Design a protein around this nucleic acid. Structure first.
Ligand SMILES: [K+]
Ligand SMILES: [Mg+2]
Ligand SMILES: [Mg+2]
Ligand SMILES: [Mg+2]
Ligand SMILES: [Mg+2]
Ligand SMILES: [Mg+2]
Ligand SMILES: [Mg+2]
Ligand SMILES: [Mg+2]
Ligand SMILES: [Mg+2]
Ligand SMILES: [Mg+2]
Ligand SMILES: [Mg+2]
Ligand SMILES: [Mg+2]
Ligand SMILES: [Mg+2]
Ligand SMILES: [Mg+2]
Ligand SMILES: [Mg+2]
Ligand SMILES: [Mg+2]
Ligand SMILES: [Mg+2]
Ligand SMILES: [Mg+2]
Ligand SMILES: [Mg+2]
Ligand code: NA
Ligand code: NA
Ligand code: NA
Lengths: 158, 298, 175
RNA sequence: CGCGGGGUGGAGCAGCCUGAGCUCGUCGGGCUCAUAACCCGAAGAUCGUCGGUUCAAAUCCGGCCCCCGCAACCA
RNA sequence: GAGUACGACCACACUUGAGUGAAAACACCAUAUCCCGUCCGAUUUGUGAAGUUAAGCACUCACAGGCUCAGUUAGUACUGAGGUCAGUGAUGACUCGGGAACCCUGAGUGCCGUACUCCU
RNA sequence: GGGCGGCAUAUCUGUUACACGACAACGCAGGUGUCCUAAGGCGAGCUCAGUGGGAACAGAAAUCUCACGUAGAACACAAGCGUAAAAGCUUGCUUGAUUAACGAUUUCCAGUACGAAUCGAGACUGCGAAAGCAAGGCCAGCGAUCCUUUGCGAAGAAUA
RNA sequence: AUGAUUAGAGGCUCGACCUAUUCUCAAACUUUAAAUGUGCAAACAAACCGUGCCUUAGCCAACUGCAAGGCCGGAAAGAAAAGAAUUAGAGGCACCAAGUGGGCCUUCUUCGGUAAGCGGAGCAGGCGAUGCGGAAUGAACCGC
């Protein structure tokens, strides 16, 4: 019956998208990965070396070690009543730079720009208002909402 | 009739190759390995000595790869050799060696390490191991020369190919390109040895001179037969006994002033030649006109 | 105008001579010597792709010897083959790809001195017609497809045979 | 139903472990007045059926049509 | 407004026919003494420049096939939460939320880099 | 129930499995205790299965040739996945199927072993012009204590 | 696309073959693709700024570049505005041990079986261990 090999039950998980076959391109090779960066562990089924176990597919973690061909990623994994930090060794073709901190980095950079403008006397941008406030509405087209006889015939096929 | 392989389902499932693979320009399997380097280097600069030969010209470039696109650090062409005294044979082995020498001198000048790495002033056609971080050769403290790796694209890497002629020119100019002498002209595979004299002769164009001399005897023998081989050579009156000296002077001239190129005319708007695309509304109107014309006939 | 361009001149790309002995051994060796003498170049053997009981052939068994001839020797061999054929070919002998071919039953008729050892052999002549510029489909770098208008058609092949060899085409359907 | 074995020239039976044999029978000619016996010759398979693998299936692996056995126990 | 070399994305870039192509390129092309490789200088390698835009290549065209983005399909199919809801059941509707796909149809037919060159 | 049968007893692929991971049955469909000095490693060249047109014998089916051909072939096996200037085919050279300082880690999982894996570091190499690529044939093909048995601790140098 | 499947039509008296359709399907088929999910981040050992400094037997042809460990300063809506969280949120760390390791039921999902108060799973509740108030009566239903 069902067996428990390394790649058991990965028929759809470890497969290329339709019309998206092929080995990784130059952009992945030129990517710089540093210790401390956030990466997403996504297996590339066309490589088959350094390929992570199926559990770590689609997980995000912190790089703790970089080798000439490999990347060490720390991944949280719940076991029983605790969460373990598992250090998986993969090849660089199975890691992509994570954007989990993109919004926070933009928020920090926006704050520094606002602080610089305030300290330099530059006029601050206007503050967006709420769309949940009361107001007067002047309609341009008003229609009667009702159930018509033709609506019942329109839902009867054949 | 017969079954149509290239039907609609065939096109819907078809996956196109990379653009440069469809055009037959880039061996991406080799390109991936050339641009690959240890992840522990964290994207430190690495250069490819790109060598490409057309029917008329030799292109030698120092290329460093980026995600946005490759950057050409320095480029040299065999068509710029007339500025250094080579007016003929801009595709032979001698021109390949000079082009590699020209690229090496220009690159070292731009980096400011020329007059420190001078290479081999006199070409003897012999082999010497290049100094690279990989091979310490004793962990000496001398400054390592600028290093690039040879890229030959889809060219067949046979013994005596002009791509290795450009390689020999670049290394003699003071550049560090890892290589072994197995593909230099004059290398004997059975004896596993290099014949520096044969390599030097092809570097200075003796083979062209011997061939030019032999054709001139044939041309003298049969004047009534129109001669095409070396036609510009004879018309310019290039004696076979002056080719070696011409290339020697070219090497000295390249080393003396590498930045020299073909003279540029002192220079106007761009005259358009593109044919304007029709608009969708125009195309629908033309199709309707054809349909109406057929309707009028029927 | 465009068909009068000098690069559209139909030329003989190669002539392929094939002898299928189908048994391997001394007969194949003698056929190889006959072909080598005719073409003035060493031939290349062909092994059987499969095992067939009725033809007495086993897979990977050497069964045929063939050769490709180009240039002046190809034209000279073609004239010899057409002379044995009286410069008369059937319409169905011409493929839609512009090539044609015929067969010789005895190699003595090719002006070849018979030898009591080598014996007599029959051969297949196949001529591949083409134009300049077909290299773009066979080169390594930037290999592409030859334009549809540059191809040699069956009609042009028969016109070439009539005009350049004074040939006669019997319009017939193969039975 | 579970386990096992077997379908081969007209008959019985080998080969059943990839590249058809035995005896009898039948046909032709001899010997005899004739038949039998005897002597000289000849023909007869597509390996039960359907698929698969293999360059090649009586052969190897699957399902089917049948045939033949061993079991179907404790109450 | 273009070309060449290396390219990033890898069809809005592919496929099939048709037409057009300034300059410089690129390319066909000529050739086999030498380097080198083949049954064959076809491929490949070397050496060349008499010829051609005929092909490649580049642009444009097609109520073209695909492809890409939208609309439609449709608040439909399906679905998280709820009932001492309906129904003999099969199942269905309702309540608070989420919300597809094909067909069909509209528009589009590469884009962005480095270096050198043409127009100049 | 037990017996008979079978094996769901160690283990691999697809499905059951409900789009993370994980999940039962004597659920479903199939595999494993082998095989390979090449069927391992590397470089180069090449493109496969099939179609169509054409060529003495030659025919459905022998070989030659030219076009089309997104893989419809092939990769020792069962299956899934993956791969086209290859991961397939051919060939030239090879022994990276060696050694590897108790490095770290994944799968099972108690976060124990065992078996398979991943990323390294060092030695000596192979292939390649070079970037590089290899410490087997990706992922199934296997074994504790005790006992038996084999290899390594070469020669010579040190007043210790 | 891969498998399965019904029937006309058009091309090349039948048939075949090809072309575009048509009727109907898939746990071990899929271009597409939810709902519900699942991983990460959301400023106090952190991150951001400085032609700042020190060290390295690290990368790079070198370096003022890159990698790393620190030092000295700076700035900090302590996280604005836009629906822009909430908490009966004291976080972590050990030590020594018991009973249990026959389960059962139910809403939805779900496999074998004609089916079963039958066998077997998933998520979560419940009984077991628990009465009380209800459905006359009922371990599991309703309320609590
Ligand atoms: K003992
Ligand atoms: Mg699934
Ligand atoms: Mg998937
Ligand atoms: Mg290569
Ligand atoms: Mg011009
Ligand atoms: Mg040629
Ligand atoms: Mg053209
Ligand atoms: Mg034209
Ligand atoms: Mg269209
Ligand atoms: Mg789930
Ligand atoms: Mg799952
Ligand atoms: Mg390869
Ligand atoms: Mg350890
Ligand atoms: Mg293994
Ligand atoms: Mg294996
Ligand atoms: Mg392995
Ligand atoms: Mg999320
Ligand atoms: Mg706020
Ligand atoms: Mg009560
Ligand atoms: Na090593
Ligand atoms: Na043992
Ligand atoms: Na009840």
């Amino acid at each position: 019956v069902h067996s428990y090999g390394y790649k058991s039950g990965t028929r759809h998980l470890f497969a290329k998208k339709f019309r998206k076959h092929g080995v990784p391109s130059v952009s992945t090779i030129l990517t710089n990965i540093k210790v401390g960066d956030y990466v997403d562990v996504v297996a590339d089924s066309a490589v088959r070396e350094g390929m992570p176990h199926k559990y770590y597919h689609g997980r995000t973690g912190i790089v703790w070690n970089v080798t000439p061909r490999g990347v060490g990623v720390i991944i949280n994994k719940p076991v029983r009543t605790r969460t373990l930090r598992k250090r998986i060794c993969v090849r660089f073709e199975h890691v992509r730079k994570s954007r989990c901190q993109e919004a926070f980095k933009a928020k920090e950079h926006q704050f520094q720009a606002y602080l610089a403008a305030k300290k330099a006397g530059k006029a601050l941008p206007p503050l967006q208002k709420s769309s949940r406030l009361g107001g007067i509405v002047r309609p341009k087209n008003v229609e009667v909402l009702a159930r018509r006889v033709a609506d019942y015939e329109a839902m009867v096929p054949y | 009739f017969v079954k149509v392989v290239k039907n609609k389902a065939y096109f819907k499932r078809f996956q196109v190759k990379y653009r440069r693979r469809r055009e037959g320009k880039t061996d991406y399997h080799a390109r991936r390995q050339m641009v690959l380097q240890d992840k522990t280097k964290f994207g430190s600069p690495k250069y490819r000595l790109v060598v490409r030969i057309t029917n008329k010209d030799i292109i030698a470039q120092i290329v460093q790869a980026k995600i946005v696109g490759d950057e050409v650090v320095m480029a040299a062409y065999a068509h710029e050799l007339p500025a250094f005294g080579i007016e003929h044979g801009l595709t032979n082995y001698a021109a390949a060696y000079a082009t590699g020498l020209l690229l090496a001198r220009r690159t070292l000048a731009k980096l400011g390490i020329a007059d420190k790495f001078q290479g081999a002033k006199e070409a003897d056609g012999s082999y010497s191991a290049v100094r690279t971080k990989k091979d310490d050769e004793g962990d000496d403290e001398e400054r390592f020369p600028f290093k690039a790796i040879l890229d030959v694209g889809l060219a067949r890497t046979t013994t005596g190919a002009r791509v290795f002629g450009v390689l020999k020119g670049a290394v003699d100019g003071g550049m560090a390109v890892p290589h072994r002498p197995n593909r230099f002209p004059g290398y004997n595979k059975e004896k596993s040895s290099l014949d520096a004299k044969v390599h030097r002769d092809r570097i200075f164009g003796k083979h062209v001179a011997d061939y030019l001399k032999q054709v001139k005897e044939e041309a003298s023998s049969n004047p009534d037969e129109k001669c095409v081989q070396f036609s510009k050579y004879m018309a310019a009156k290039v004696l076979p006994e002056s080719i070696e000296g011409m290339y020697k002077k070219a090497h000295a001239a390249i080393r003396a002033d590498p930045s020299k190129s073909l003279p540029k005319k002192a220079k106007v708007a761009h005259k358009s030649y593109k044919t304007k695309k029709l608009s969708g509304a125009e195309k629908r109107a033309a199709a309707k006109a054809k349909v109406a014309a057929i309707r009028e006939r029927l | 105008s465009k068909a009068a361009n000098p690069m559209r001149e139909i030329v003989v790309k190669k002539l392929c001579i094939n002898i299928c002995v189908g048994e391997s051994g001394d007969r194949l060796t003698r056929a190889s010597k006959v072909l080598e003498q005719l073409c003035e170049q060493t031939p290349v053997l062909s092994r059987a792709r499969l095992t067939v009981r009725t033809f007495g052939i086993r897979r990977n068994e050497k069964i045929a010897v063939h050769c490709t001839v180009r240039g002046k020797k190809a034209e000279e061999l073609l004239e010899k083959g057409l002379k044995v054929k009286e410069f008369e070919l059937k319409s169905y002998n011409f493929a839609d790809t512009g090539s044609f071919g015929f067969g010789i039953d005895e190699h003595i008729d090719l002006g070849i001195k018979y030898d009591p050892s080598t014996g007599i052999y029959g051969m297949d002549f196949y001529v591949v017609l083409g134009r300049r510029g077909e290299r773009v489909a066979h080169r390594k770098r930037k290999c592409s497809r030859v334009g549809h208008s540059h191809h040699v058609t069956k009609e042009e092949a028969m016109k070439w045979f009539e005009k350049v060899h004074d040939g006669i085409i019997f319009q017939a359907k193969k039975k």
